[PDB]
Structures are given as structure tokens and as C-alpha cells.
User: Which sequence fits this backbone?
DNA sequence: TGCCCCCCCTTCGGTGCTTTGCACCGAAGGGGGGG
């Protein structure tokens, strides 16, 4: 039935009128599907006949539903959505089963005909005008407008959600020791009451919904474990994901690989150790979704590893709020991190991964800090607090980073855990110049308009070099000049540059880069024993810098 | 009483900023606070057909031990119509930074007795999240002058003057400045004497409806140069690049006769003797930097900018300016937290301290250039914020070329 | 031939700098999942 809740007033955007779009052809099974729904929707007051006085229109269709032998009616409101006012969406996130507590008694209910049980603002109805075709031969169609929320209108999800919240609010206040997870039209209801009182509360909640016009079909009233909920399976003491089927293919397209990565990301919330770096590398620089992409050797290996992980059965546990949350992180290589969140050892609440590259140039310590930040945010969302961390980095390593790095940085209460590979700084610049080490004065210049440039150095030991460069930039030649000094120096070197750009990158102790040049410099820094790096201003006649600047021209 | 008609600036729409996640204890506090405010008609439940939003969170002062709701109206204030344009603004008094002690009072609750233009209320919406997204967000908007909105001191201006006249009447040498939800009240009375008319000013206010600042020890920190018996090539290169930077700020600082002590391709560890004429250059340069720069004056029509550098061992340098290299103030903030273990807390406290000094001195907060990754700041700062206002800020990655400010 | 939400990975384009490319960032394309 239609709720007697007050309608939500809605507006077109200012200046705009309503849509005016012709209808298209559908099959005979997709006209009987709708006419069955359409003269029956009219019987229940969901729609009303209109005629030519209303000048608006929008086309209509139907698609099959996972429930077999039921159809879903849909109108293509793309034009109307454009001219309809914005909404503030109240669905802020997706509930997660690792955020649930154990409950003695559990029920899962669906509200039936959810959108069609909520009425639509009187003055807006006429903008929802459509037409029902009937095979497209010998009849043009008859016109209806919606009296309730249409599926396919931009406002329908939010106005339904907000309506459901208002209807549930009396019941939640009345029963504060009953948790109700409300996702769209799906209701999880947990309690610590014996199943007797619990089912009393349930049908009492069902009757409250029914006076407000919301049926709860028995078909979708789950009463026994395992409950099917939000893509998971709720057991009394544990939860699982519903089975994940990966594509298996002789030949792969971009679009297949896109599907594969998405499945693995979804799996990674409970399957520890999933990796997608090498499969996603295949997506780079491609240019059609139907382009065949041959898997690299590294992608096959990564795919096979993920497949082994997926064959093993896994489960999460539920949240015990009387125990700490603990987050443990491991390093996987090539900027990939996996993590587990638990309270008792070897009993995961969930897992995950962090593998974004932020910045052209970074190091493992920064990326570890980002993973920590992503886990901290996810823990606030799911459990409302941050966890204690277990990290594969020594206290000394961290302490040397936050003293030598010029940006404020932090990570919460953490305990070192020895699970190699450990996160470490790969080199450290000397705070002071090195006695007995050679002093290189470096410089590189490029011609803005030519592409041509030079990198070079002079030395307190009389060494000097200039190399020609083609197809380069100002910043590149400066990086190149440092590259050569490192290439030709011993295990210990003092370097003076006039590029604050180059100093900026290297002072941040990067261990990886999207630049091959910066990568080459990093490998040289890692092989050295000591390096002091100094800056001076250019073109002020400073001894050393002046002579090499002299020489690069 | 009657609303004052309020508008956004021409061709701007209202704020549309997503709510960020909150801890259990902040969500509980917001639900307690908003429920009570709903009952008193100060806010009203709204739905999703209002398309505006502004983030909400909560702060608990350690001494107070009670939560304070903080709505981040920075976006809304930028889009709200100027009130100095309509001439309803609050003059800054130059006497405040002269006082021995200044106490901060949170008086935001007085705003809740004045209603807000019904056509403007929708711009004030906010949304309380829920743990593990058990429910959709819950939305309110204001019916009264909101805390944190720049329009509320301006509209309430006429009234707080009436409320404060007897106190000021009676205490002519105490100076009171309203900034947003705050009263800044300074005097020269003795440390425990000053506190007591603080407490009397309170009762006069509680009869309609932080921790002592001390400006005359807000020491300026100038640029200084090392002093040594003996100088390496590297010392002199560092000295030359530092003074070269500083000549963008000061007048007639020269490097010509320190720079040629370095003629030649020399080892960084070689000890170069100072010529008579380099010793001249340097002791000369030392005093140009001794006293402040001549020609730098505050302009109320322009914004204030603040830069901070982490220096280590809990120290933080800062400069406030409006035009580059024309610093109105240069300072050094020192952490007193204890362990020395938290950079983000230190920086958050430093931003509050610097911003407070700008309010006391010029009457408004500066836009900060913060030496931190955006995502490190946003993971933690609200845990350490204690002010009822929030300044503008942006994130910079600037390595030191020189260590100018040490 | 529809709608709304979260996530990850890739690409693109706008902004500001004592720039002439570069690094950063938010939006939008693809995919996963929920209703
Ligand atoms: N593909 C989809 C799926 C759901 N929806 C929305 C989200 S919630 C609302 C549910 O619709 P209904 O309850 O009326 O039909 P259902 O498929 O749920 O069966 P019943 O519950 O038995 O009545 O439809 C949509 O717009 N598009
Ligand atoms: O921290 C920046 C981040 O915060 C948001 C609010 O979520 O913006 C706020 O801070 C900005 C910087 O001062 C203001 O410009 C803005 O008006 C204020 O809401 C995000 O928009 C931004 O990414
Ligand atoms: Mg349903």
C-alpha cells in the first residue's frame, strides 16, 4: 500500500522545464510484463492516466530480476534527472559485517514494493509522464504519471531512505537494545532476547511498518542462519563472503582484466594477501575495452597466486567491543601492502590492501604511513575507534625518519613485529660534509626552445666532465648532473648543486619513482656509503658552482 | 523579533561539503547535543531535498571535560555577503595586544536567542554520521544565529554592546574584543586579580544568557647567523646563501666580499680564514638583521598569510605576512606537550597559538601554509583542536634550501 | 538504453610556481560490491 507519510517537496532546477522525449520499442514479453504491472499499478493508485494537456514525456522499459518469474519496471529518466534539483544523499557508507556484535537472536527482513509504497510530491508528478507502447504496431500508447517514487528517478533512493528513517525512529527509541541495520529496504535486526521475546518484537516491528504502508513478504523474511546480507553470510560465530567466481579465459580483453581486478579487490576484504599490481599494469596505455591484452609472465604469476589464496576457505569473526582492535601490516613489494584487523590472534575481523602510488617520488616509510592512515579511517567508519598497530618497522627507523624529514608526520601507538621484509630507509644523507671525500660541483642547463642541454661537474681534485643532452628539460639536466657526480665518485662524496628542485626530491629520501632518471639516482644513492648534498644560489660567482656553470656553456 | 535579511555573494551557491567519519564518543556527543537543541527549537530535522551540507564534529576542552559541538562553516562564511559592506562589522581595538593578560570566553550560546532569516536557514544544513553506517545520516538546519557563522557576531552586534556597556562603563581600562563566538578580554591586573573580574563578567553574561594569554612575552625571533672561531668553505657557502635569501627582505645586505673568499674549486671541509673585509661585511649584516625591517605596515584590506617550518626538538618557526618578504611578525613556537612524540599535535597547537595571536593583534586569523601532507593532517587534527573558530589553510611541500629561521 | 552509495586503478585536465615542466589534486572513465 501507499504510506500516509507526508511527501517530500521537490523542485526542478531554476530556469528548467520538464522532459519531452519519445518512447522506443520493446519485446512482447516486455509489454505484458509492464501492462500487468501498469493497469495493476493503476489499480493500487501508484500511477494515473494522463492525456495531451500534460506536454511532458519520458520512455519506459523492463529488465529481468534475479528472483525468477518477477520483472522490474524502469523509466529512462536521464533527461528529468538532469533538470531535477540536487539532493544531499544520506547513505554515507556501506555497513560491514565485521562491525556487527554477536547477537543471541537475529532476523533479516526486506520491505516489499519499497519505492512504490512512498508517495511523490503532488506538484512534481506531472514531470514523470510516460507512455506504454504495446509492440509498437496499431497503437501509439497511453500516458500515465507516477504518484509514487519511480525507479530511475534521481530523487527516489534518498526520499525512500529518509522516509524509512522517520518510520523506524519511533520503534528504535522504544527498543534501544535492538540493533536495526537499515540499508535501503533491507533490515537486519539483532537482539539479546530469547527467541520467544525476539519474535514478539519482530512482528511488532512488522506491524508498525504495515500501518505505515510497508509490507514485509515472508519470502524474504529470514529467520535461521545462515542469513544472506549485503553480499555476505552470517553464521552465529562467523561470517563469509558469498562465493567469488573469477573469469577464466584463453584470450583476455581490457574489459575482462578490469572485471578480474574488481573481483580481487572485493575478495581482499577477507582473503589475506591478494595482489593486483601486475594485472592492473596491463590496463595502462590501452585504448579500447575490446582490445586483446596478452598477460605478461608477472601477471600470470600474480593471477595464479591469487587463485591459490581463493581456493582456501576463509571467514571473518564479529566485533567484541570489550577487547582492543589490532591492525597488522605486511609489505608485499612494488608499493603493495596487505593488512589484517583482529582482536584475538588468527581470528580476523577483516583484511584489506593498500597499493596506491601517491606522488611521482616516494619511499616505503611514506607509503607505510598512508596504509596506516587508510586503516585508521576504515576503523573509525566500521568500529568508531582506531586500532593498536603492529608494524614491520623498527623504532629506530621511524625515529630517524621523523627527525630528518621536514614535514610533520606521525603514527599512533604501534609495536614492532618482525615479519620481513621490514620497512627501512635505504640511505641517509649526512648532516655534515665528509672529511677526505671529494667535492663535486654540479650543474646542468637546457635550452627552453631547443630541447638541447648539458650536464657536468668540476671537482676539488681537478676532475671535470660535460655531457651533451638531447630532448631534455631544465630540471632533467640538473638531475642528470647529480647522476654523473654519483656515477664517477667513490663510496663517499660531497655534492653542491644550485637546483632546489633536485635537492627537494633527494632530501626526501625517495626509494622509488615514476621517473627512470630519478630511479637511477636512487640506486646510486643506495650503493654509496656517505653522501653530503649542499645547495648554493646560482649565478652569484660562488667558488666551484661558478666554474662548472662556466663550463656547461 | 525580526530576521535580518541575509544573502550569499552574487552568483555563489551554498556549501556542499561531505561529512567525514567520527569516533563513537564524538557521535554520541553530537546526538546528545543536537537532540536537546531540536527540543529547544534551535535546529530542525531536515531531509535530503535540502542539497547543502557542512561538516560537523566535536571538541572537548581538557579543563571543561564536556563536549562542544563545532560546525565547520568555513565554506559558508566565504560565500556569505560581507557585513562591513552593509556596515554591521566589529571594530578591532589596538589596545588589546598591550595588556598583561587576556582571557578567552566562549559566548556562542548568546547567538541562540536571535532567529535567522528563514530563506537563509537551508544553507546551514549538517549531517551526523552513524557507526558502521547502521543508519543513513541524520540532518538538521539552524533556526537561530549559528555558532561559527560569520553573520552571527555581526547581526548580534547591536545587542552585545548593550549587554557589555555596564561592565565596560565600570572597567574603562579592560578592553573587550569580539571575534566570532569568542570574547577576548585583557587587562593589567595581577594574575589572580585579573581572573576575578573575568568571573564577574561571566555572571553579568549568565544573567541574560581558555587559559590566560600573555602578549608582552610573544617574543619575536629574528634571523641570526652562526658565531664561530673557524669557518669551513661549507660554513661560508651556507652563510652566503642565507644572506642572499635575506636580501629579498632587508636592504643593502651584501655578499661580494664573502663570496670571493671562495674563489676556486675548493673542498667543503677546508677552513678558509676571514679577511678583514669579510669580517666587516658580516658584523655589518648581523645588525641589519638585529632590529626590524623599515617600511612594513599592516593593511586591513588584505589577507594575512602564515608559514610554519618544523625545526626539530619540538621547535616550530613561523612568519606572518601579507606581501611576500614583508613579514609583520616572525616567531618561534615551542612544544610543551611533554614526551616530544607527536608532530601533528604540536603543529595543530602551533596553528591555534599563531591564529590566536593574529586575533589579538589584528583582529582576524591568517591563512596557513602548513608543512604537512593533506592526508596526514586530515587523519588527526580534530583530535587536538580546542578553538571555536577554524582558520583557512593549505598544504605545502617545501624542503629547506637554507635554514633561514635557525 | 534507469536510480542512489561505498571501494580500487587509470587517465585527464586545472592550478601555481620569483615555472617555461612539474608536482599536486579532484573529477571522471573503467571495474567490483550493496539496495
Ligand atoms: N536494480 C535495482 C534494484 C533495486 N532498486 C531499488 C533499491 S531498493 C528498491 C526495492 O524495490 P522493491 O522492494 O519494490 O522490489 P524488490 O526487488 O525488493 O522485491 P520485493 O522486496 O519483494 O518487493 O528498489 C533499484 O532501483 N534498482
Ligand atoms: O583540509 C582541507 C579539506 O577540508 C575541506 C572540508 O572537508 O575544506 C575545508 O577547508 C578548506 C581549507 O581551508 C576550506 O577552503 C573549505 O572551505 C573548508 O570546508 C575540504 O573541502 C578540503 O579538501
Ligand atoms: Mg523490497
Assistant:
Amino acid at each position: 500500500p501507499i504510506s500516509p507519510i507526508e511527501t517530500v517537496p521537490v523542485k526542478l532546477k531554476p530556469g528548467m522545464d520538464g522532459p519531452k522525449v519519445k518512447q522506443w520499442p520493446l519485446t512482447e514479453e516486455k509489454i505484458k510484463a509492464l501492462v500487468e504491472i501498469c493497469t495493476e499499478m493503476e489499480k493500487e493508485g501508484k500511477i494515473s492516466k494522463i492525456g495531451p494537456e500534460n506536454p511532458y514525456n519520458t520512455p519506459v522499459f523492463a529488465i529481468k530480476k534475479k528472483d525468477s518469474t518477477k520483472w522490474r519496471k524502469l523509466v529512462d529518466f536521464r533527461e528529468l534527472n538532469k533538470r531535477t534539483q540536487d539532493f544531499w544523499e544520506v547513505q554515507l557508507g556501506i555497513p560491514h559485517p565485521a562491525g556487527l556484535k554477536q547477537k543471541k537472536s537475529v532476523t533479516v527482513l526486506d520491505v516489499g514494493d519499497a519505492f512504490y509504497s512512498v508517495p511523490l510530491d503532488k506538484d512534481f508528478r506531472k514531470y514523470t509522464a510516460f507512455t506504454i507502447p504495446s509492440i509498437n504496431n496499431e497503437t501509439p500508447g497511453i500516458r500515465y504519471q507516477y504518484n509514487v517514487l519511480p525507479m530511475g528517478w534521481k530523487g527516489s533512493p534518498a526520499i525512500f531512505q529518509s522516509s524509512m528513517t522517520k518510520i523506524l525512529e519511533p520503534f528504535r527509541k522504544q527498543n534501544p537494545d535492538i540493533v536495526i541495520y537499515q540499508y535501503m529496504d533491507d533490515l537486519y535486526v539483532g537482539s539479546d532476547l530469547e527467541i520467544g521475546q525476539h519474535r514478539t518484537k519482530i512482528e511488532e516491528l512488522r506491524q508498525h511498518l504495515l500501518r505505515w504502508g510497508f509490507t514485509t513478504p515472508d519470502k524474504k523474511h529470514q529467520k535461521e542462519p545462515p542469513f544472506l546480507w549485503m553480499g555476505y553470510e552470517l553464521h552465529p560465530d562467523k561470517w563469509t563472503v558469498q562465493p567469488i567466481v573469477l573469469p577464466e579465459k584463453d584470450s583476455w580483453t581490457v574489459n575482462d582484466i578490469q572485471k578480474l581486478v574488481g573481483k580481487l579487490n572485493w575478495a581482499s576484504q577477507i582473503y589475506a594477501g591478494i595482489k593486483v599490481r601486475q594485472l592492473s599494469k596491463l590496463l595502462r596505455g590501452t585504448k579500447a575495452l575490446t582490445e586483446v591484452v596478452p598477460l605478461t609472465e608477472e601477471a600470470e604469476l600474480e593471477l595464479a597466486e591469487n587463485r591459490e589464496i581463493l581456493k582456501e576457505p576463509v571467514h571473518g569473526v564479529y566485533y567484541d567491543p570489550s577487547k582492543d582492535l589490532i591492525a597488522e601490516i605486511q609489505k608485499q613489494g612494488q608499493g603493495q601492502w596487505t593488512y589484517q584487523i583482529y582482536q584475538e590472534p588468527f581470528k580476523n575481523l577483516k583484511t584489506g590492501k593498500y597499493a596506491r602510488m601517491k606522488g611521482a617520488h616516494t619511499n616505503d616509510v611514506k607509503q607505510l604511513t598512508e596504509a596506516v592512515q587508510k586503516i585508521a579511517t576504515e576503523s573509525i567508519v566500521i568500529w568508531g575507534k582506531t586500532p593498536k598497530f603492529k608494524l614491520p618497522i623498527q623504532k629506530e627507523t621511524w625515529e630517524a625518519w621523523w627527525t630528518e624529514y621536514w614535514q610533520a608526520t606521525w603514527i599512533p601507538e604501534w609495536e614492532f613485529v618482525n615479519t620481513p621484509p621490514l620497512v627501512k630507509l635505504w640511505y641517509q644523507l649526512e648532516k655534515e660534509p665528509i672529511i677526505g671525500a671529494e667535492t663535486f660541483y654540479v650543474d646542468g642547463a637546457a635550452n627552453r626552445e631547443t630541447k638541447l642541454g648539458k650536464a657536468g661537474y668540476v671537482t676539488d681534485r681537478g676532475r671535470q666532465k660535460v655531457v651533451p643532452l638531447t630532448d631534455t628539460t631544465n630540471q632533467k639536466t640538473e638531475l642528470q648532473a647529480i647522476h654523473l657526480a654519483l656515477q664517477d665518485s667513490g663510496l663517499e662524496v660531497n655534492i653542491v648543486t644550485d637546483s632546489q628542485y633536485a635537492l627537494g626530491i633527494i632530501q626526501a629520501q625517495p626509494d622509488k619513482s615514476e621517473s627512470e632518471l630519478v630511479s637511477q639516482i636512487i640506486e646510486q644513492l643506495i650503493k654509496k656509503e656517505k653522501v653530503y648534498l649542499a645547495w648554493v644560489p646560482a649565478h652569484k660567482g660562488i667558488g666551484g658552482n661558478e666554474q662548472v656553470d662556466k663550463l656547461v656553456s | 523579533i525580526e530576521t535580518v535579511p541575509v544573502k550569499l555573494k552574487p552568483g555563489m551557491d551554498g556549501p556542499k561539503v561531505k561529512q567525514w567519519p567520527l569516533t563513537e564518543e564524538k557521535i554520541k556527543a553530537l546526538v546528545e547535543i543536537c537532540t536537546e537543541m531540536e527540543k529547544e527549537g534551535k535546529i530542525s530535522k531536515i531531509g535530503p531535498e535540502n542539497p547543502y551540507n557542512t561538516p560537523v564534529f566535536a571538541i572537548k576542552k581538557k579543563d571543561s571535560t564536556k563536549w562542544r559541538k563545532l560546525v565547520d562553516f568555513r565554506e559558508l562564511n566565504k560565500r556569505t555577503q560581507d557585513f562591513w559592506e552593509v556596515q554591521l562589522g566589529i571594530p578591532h581595538p589596538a589596545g588589546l595586544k598591550q595588556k598583561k593578560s587576556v582571557t578567552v570566553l566562549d559566548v556562542g550560546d548568546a547567538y541562540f536567542s536571535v532567529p535567522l532569516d528563514k530563506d537563509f536557514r537551508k544553507y546551514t544544513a549538517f549531517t551526523i554520521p552513524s557507526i558502521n553506517n547502521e543508519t543513513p545520516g541524520i540532518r538538521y538546519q539552524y533556526n537561530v544565529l549559528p555558532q561559527g557563522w560569520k553573520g552571527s557576531p555581526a547581526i548580534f552586534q547591536s545587542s552585545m554592546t548593550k549587554i557589555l556597556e555596564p561592565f565596560r562603563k565600570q572597567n574603562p581600562d579592560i578592553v573587550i574584543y569580539q571575534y566570532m563566538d569568542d570574547l577576548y578580554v585583557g587587562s593589567d591586573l595581577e594574575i589572580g586579580q585579573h581572573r576575578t573580574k573575568i568571573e564577574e563578567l561571566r555572571q553579568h553574561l549568565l544573567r541574560w544568557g581558555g587559559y590566560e594569554l600573555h602578549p608582552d612575552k610573544w617574543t619575536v625571533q629574528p634571523i641570526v647567523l652562526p658565531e664561530k672561531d673557524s669557518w669551513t668553505v661549507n660554513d661560508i657557502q651556507k652563510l652566503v646563501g642565507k644572506l642572499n635569501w635575506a636580501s629579498q627582505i632587508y636592504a643593502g645586505i651584501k655578499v661580494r666580499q664573502l663570496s670571493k673568499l671562495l674563489r676556486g674549486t675548493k673542498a667543503l671541509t677546508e677552513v678558509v680564514p676571514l679577511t678583514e673585509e669579510a669580517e666587516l661585511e658580516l658584523a655589518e649584516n648581523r645588525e641589519i638583521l638585529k632590529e626590524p625591517v623599515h617600511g612594513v605596515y599592516y593593511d586591513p584590506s588584505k589577507d594575512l598569510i602564515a608559514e610554519i617550518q618544523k625545526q626539530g626538538q619540538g621547535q616550530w618557526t613561523y612568519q606572518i605576512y601579507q606581501e611576500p618578504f614583508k613579514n609583520l611578525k616572525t616567531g618561534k613556537y615551542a612544544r610543551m606537550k611533554g614526551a616530544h612524540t607527536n608532530d601533528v599535535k604540536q603543529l595543530t597547537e602551533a596553528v591555534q597559538k599563531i591564529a590566536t595571536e593574529s586575533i589579538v593583534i589584528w583582529g582576524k586569523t591568517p591563512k596557513f601554509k602548513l608543512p604537512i601532507q593533506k592526508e596526514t593532517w586530515e587523519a588527526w587534527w580534530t583530535e587536538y583542536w580546542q578553538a571555536t573558530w577554524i582558520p583557512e589553510w593549505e598544504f605545502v611541500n617545501t624542503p629547506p634550501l637554507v635554514k633561514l629561521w635557525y
Summary: The domain at 5-94+120-160 of chain B is CATH 3.10.10.10 (HIV Type 1 Reverse Transcriptase; Chain A, domain 1). The pocket of magnesium ion (ligand 3) is lined by residues A 110-112, 114, 185 (CB under 6 Å).
